[PDB]
């Protein structure tokens, strides 16, 4: 069926709002990020609009916190691509149930508050 | 006794975000606040052109210079000594214009992750 309702099938992005994280070397940081994704299955995505919108954003936040909590501050700067690619794999696993491919994750800013 | 009343108490201005490199080659974005007051009304009014030109730009240069001489770990730990050092540098320059820099505060320190080695 050539459905009348159509969905953007190309790369789009949402921001992960700043998450407060404790590094392995005990530094308190605020980290925000960007998730790049696209609908790969229009039928699954249309079926899961409510179940994916909320759940994906929260999972992006949790995925970030868990990944960064296991690293030293130094590692977060130098291993940023490894960390991001690991997050992308974790996020892409969960989003498949909702017809979404996560293509890329980027760690944006690491804020250091008054310690 | 004067009709025009120059504010003689603490005022603040913001130092716009400064992108700079640490001693250990980390790119950071840092901003701050400078708390000052007029201590000499006559001298400040006389040197108003000097103060409006130099002070804000001096706060920027002093911040950039201080952060370039510190390691990231030191910026995390010694944020108070850096601010106190800046206060002394700024206060030395503003004294000639009847202005006392009372306190410098380092607010946000961000690591643009995409912009590193």
Swiss-Prot record, chain B:
Keyword tags: Cell membrane, Cytoplasm, Cytoplasmic vesicle, Cytoskeleton, Lipoprotein, Membrane, Palmitate, Phosphoprotein
Compartment(s) of residence: Cell membrane; Cytoplasm, Cytoskeleton; Membrane raft; Melanosome
Signal sequence coordinates: none
Consequence when changing residue 109 to P: Abolishes homodimerization and oligomerization. Abolishes regulation of ASIC2 and ASIC3 channel activity
GO CC list: cytoplasm; cytoskeleton; cytosol; endoplasmic reticulum; melanosome; membrane raft; mitochondrion; perinuclear region of cytoplasm
Residues recorded with modification Phosphoserine: 73
GO biological-process terms attached to the record: positive regulation by host of viral genome replication; positive regulation of protein targeting to membrane; positive regulation of viral process; regulation of monoatomic ion transmembrane transport
Family: Belongs to the band 7/mec-2 family.
Role, per record: Regulates ion channel activity and transmembrane ion transport. Regulates ASIC2 and ASIC3 channel activity.
Subunit structure, interactors included: Interacts with LANCL1. Interacts with SLC2A1. Interacts with SLC4A1; this interaction positively regulates SLC4A1 activity. Identified in large complexes with SLC40A1, SLC14A1, SLC29A1 and AQP1. Homodimer and higher order homooligomers. The homodimer is banana-shaped. Interacts with ASIC1, ASIC2 and ASIC3. Interacts with STOML1; may redistribute STOM from the plasma membrane to late endosomes.
Protein name, entry field: Stomatin
Species this chain originates from: Mus musculus
Source taxonomy: Eukaryota, Metazoa, Chordata, Craniata, Vertebrata
Gene assigned in the entry: Stom
């Amino acid at each position: 069926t050539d459905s009348l309702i159509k969905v953007d099938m190309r790369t789009i992005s949402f921001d992960i709002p700043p998450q407060e994280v404790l590094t392995k070397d005990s530094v308190t940081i605020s980290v925000d990020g960007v998730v790049y994704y696209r609908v790969q299955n229009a039928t699954l995505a249309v079926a899961n609009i409510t179940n994916a919108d909320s759940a994906t954003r929260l999972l992006a936040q949790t995925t970030l916190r868990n990944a960064l909590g296991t690293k030293n501050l130094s590692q977060i700067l130098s291993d940023r691509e490894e960390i991001a690619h690991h997050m992308q794999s974790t996020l892409d696993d969960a989003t498949d149930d909702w017809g979404i491919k996560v293509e890329r994750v980027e760690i944006k800013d690491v804020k250091l508050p008054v310690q």
